[PDB]
Amino acid sequence: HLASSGHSY
Amino acid sequence: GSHSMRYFYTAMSRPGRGEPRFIAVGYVDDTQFVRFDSDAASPRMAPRAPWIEQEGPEYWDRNTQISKTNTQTYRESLRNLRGYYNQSEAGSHIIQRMYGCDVGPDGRLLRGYDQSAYDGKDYIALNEDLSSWTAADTAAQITQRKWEAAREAEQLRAYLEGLCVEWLRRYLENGKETLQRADPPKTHVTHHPISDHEATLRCWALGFYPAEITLTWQRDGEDQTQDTELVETRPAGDRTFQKWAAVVVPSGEEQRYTCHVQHEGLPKPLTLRWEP
Amino acid sequence: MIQRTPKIQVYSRHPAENGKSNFLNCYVSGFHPSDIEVDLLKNGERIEKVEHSDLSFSKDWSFYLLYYTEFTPTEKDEYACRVNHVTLSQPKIVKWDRDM
């Protein structure tokens, strides 16, 4: 399962 | 007995040719099992291994949502990083990302990973402690302070120690007949003369899974690492891999040379000579 | 700004037997950036309906892809792989060497 969408760079 | 799950993100801008492309693939050890390509007709998380097909609609919907959100976030990030380096709008650039977990034979977390690159250069990586960052330059320091403010490291630690290990254990069970089956290589040795005084000995390994293998030539029982041509391990297309090691030997001296093969699927490590 | 040129290997999935179906593989690796053109050639002409693996990359961030198609080798037919990349001044052609 993917990790949840992280923060923008 | 030891295993890994890794996901790989590639976000590539193409100015003048539309919006940046976002691609996500997932592996368990050397087996791909999911993919997402934002260029697809219908962008969705799609199966790539039979043992993942049995997951239910919530799984496919959630993983597709993460990936569709990631598509827009990676577009924002390519623009941000272009700013951080004073780059013009004309060039194409790539963010790559790799994260995942290693578990031991019992299934307990060995270590977690999360690393990013920009145009192929290391940019920022989660440290082994799953709680601090290593930034490669003053641009990645901006990303680091954003990620500290977002508690990104904390959220990734929770994932890497929780969901990552738990789903990996689930996948290794659902796909045990392949993921947990090591196929030994089929081996042989060949002999091609180059001249009147020298010949090439080539040790072959075929049909093995996983890709991890050790092929070495010895002369009088001593390693020929300097003199061995090692081709890069290559996929056969049927899940298995291929490799060869080659040494150039004086004519007549062939029998002082043994090829040694180590692979998880082998009962015992192998020693091979040329058999004329 | 950091570009790496592809490594190319041309080989068959199974050991080659004239008259018997098989797969012809062209594996390109070690390259950056990711845009690449790979064609499989039968006696110098492009083959239709080649497929390729999904894009991924190695620990050192360089990309790799496998291009493959079904084929049955004969003794007369020659096969090769034709690769173009930003690092290459003109397409590179790598012949299938059977004994390798």
Side-chain angles (χ1 to χ4, degrees):
Chain A
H1 198 292
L2 289 170
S4 290
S5 293
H7 195 285
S8 63
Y9 291 64
Chain B
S2 295
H3 296 284
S4 61
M5 185 167 68
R6 301 288 199 263
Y7 288 91
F8 303 80
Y9 295 167
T10 303
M12 48 237 108
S13 67
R14 36 193 184 185
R17 301 190 286 117
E19 285 295 292
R21 188 187 198 148
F22 180 82
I23 290 176
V25 297
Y27 284 79
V28 177
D29 307 317
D30 300 325
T31 297
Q32 187 185 338
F33 69 101
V34 283
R35 87 173 167 205
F36 176 91
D37 184 349
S38 69
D39 274 355
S42 86
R44 302 209 81 247
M45 209 72 186
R48 300 301 268 150
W51 46 262
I52 198 77
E53 283 159 12
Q54 72 185 271
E55 295 306 331
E58 268 215 311
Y59 179 96
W60 296 111
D61 280 335
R62 179 63 179 126
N63 280 267
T64 287
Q65 190 41 240
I66 294 173
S67 296
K68 289 181 97 280
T69 303
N70 284 340
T71 305
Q72 312 295 319
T73 295
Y74 275 80
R75 291 174 174 168
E76 195 190 327
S77 297
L78 283 158
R79 298 191 303 261
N80 293 357
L81 259 67
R82 187 183 74 87
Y84 300 166
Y85 294 104
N86 317 299
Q87 288 164 328
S88 71
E89 282 209 28
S92 170
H93 304 267
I94 301 188
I95 294 175
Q96 299 162 264
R97 194 167 191 170
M98 190 282 311
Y99 65 88
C101 46
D102 293 342
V103 306
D106 40 338
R108 108 151 180 92
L109 174 69
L110 297 176
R111 75 155 286 170
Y113 306 81
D114 181 77
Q115 304 171 255
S116 292
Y118 187 54
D119 293 338
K121 285 188 68 81
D122 285 287
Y123 182 75
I124 196 175
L126 190 60
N127 289 320
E128 198 172 348
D129 63 7
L130 304 188
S131 66
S132 56
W133 301 97
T134 294
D137 53 28
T138 60
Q141 289 169 21
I142 312 296
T143 296
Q144 181 182 335
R145 309 178 301 105
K146 296 193 176 175
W147 284 4
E148 290 166 346
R151 304 174 43 85
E152 180 104 354
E154 286 72 39
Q155 290 175 61
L156 276 168
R157 180 184 174 175
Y159 167 89
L160 289 165
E161 297 187 318
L163 278 167
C164 193
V165 176
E166 290 162 14
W167 278 103
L168 176 47
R169 162 154 37 250
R170 200 204 198 268
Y171 300 148
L172 294 164
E173 172 71 26
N174 291 162
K176 52 185 166 172
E177 302 181 349
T178 46
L179 300 184
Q180 296 190 77
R181 178 184 94 236
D183 299 322
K186 302 169 186 68
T187 54
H188 68 274
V189 175
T190 67
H191 183 274
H192 326 257
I194 319 147
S195 63
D196 301 328
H197 49 48
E198 282 182 325
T200 282
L201 288 179
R202 177 164 292 115
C203 192
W204 289 86
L206 310 165
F208 56 91
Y209 183 91
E212 170 64 17
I213 198 165
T214 300
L215 281 192
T216 46
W217 274 107
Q218 276 181 3
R219 176 179 174 276
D220 308 333
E222 300 262 300
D223 276 82
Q224 294 294 110
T225 300
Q226 293 323 300
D227 310 89
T228 304
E229 184 181 15
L230 273 188
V231 82
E232 168 184 19
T233 311
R234 50 191 214 205
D238 62 8
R239 137 196 167 93
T240 69
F241 297 88
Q242 307 183 347
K243 199 180 191 66
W244 56 255
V247 73
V248 165
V249 306
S251 294
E253 290 182 17
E254 280 91 1
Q255 292 310 311
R256 311 160 50 172
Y257 288 88
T258 50
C259 172
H260 299 268
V261 185
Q262 306 195 270
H263 188 271
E264 184 191 341
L266 280 180
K268 324 288 199 175
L270 289 184
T271 301
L272 294 69
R273 287 164 212 90
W274 180 48
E275 288 166 45
Chain C
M1 194 203 213
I2 319 87
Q3 301 185 324
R4 313 182 218 166
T5 178
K7 299 169 278 203
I8 312 172
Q9 290 194 67
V10 188
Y11 54 101
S12 49
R13 173 182 307 190
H14 305 294
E17 154 163 338
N18 287 328
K20 175 164 158 281
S21 202
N22 204 335
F23 286 84
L24 172 82
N25 288 333
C26 186
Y27 179 62
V28 298
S29 59
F31 56 96
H32 208 288
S34 52
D35 282 348
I36 194 155
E37 269 173 280
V38 180
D39 281 304
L40 295 181
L41 308 188
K42 179 180 181 182
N43 301 312
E45 289 297 354
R46 168 174 179 279
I47 293 158
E48 309 201 321
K49 318 204 310 189
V50 173
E51 310 171 68
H52 62 80
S53 61
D54 298 327
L55 189 76
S56 199
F57 54 87
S58 310
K59 283 196 199 178
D60 69 4
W61 307 107
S62 63
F63 294 98
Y64 61 91
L65 292 181
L66 175 62
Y67 286 73
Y68 58 101
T69 195
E70 179 254 335
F71 81 132
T72 87
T74 70
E75 179 225 37
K76 176 270 209 192
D77 295 331
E78 284 220 310
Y79 291 88
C81 184
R82 175 180 67 206
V83 178
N84 212 348
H85 190 263
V86 62
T87 58
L88 292 175
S89 168
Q90 65 264 318
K92 194 173 311 202
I93 295 131
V94 182
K95 308 253 204 289
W96 183 38
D97 190 317
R98 289 173 82 142
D99 62 283
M100 259 201 72

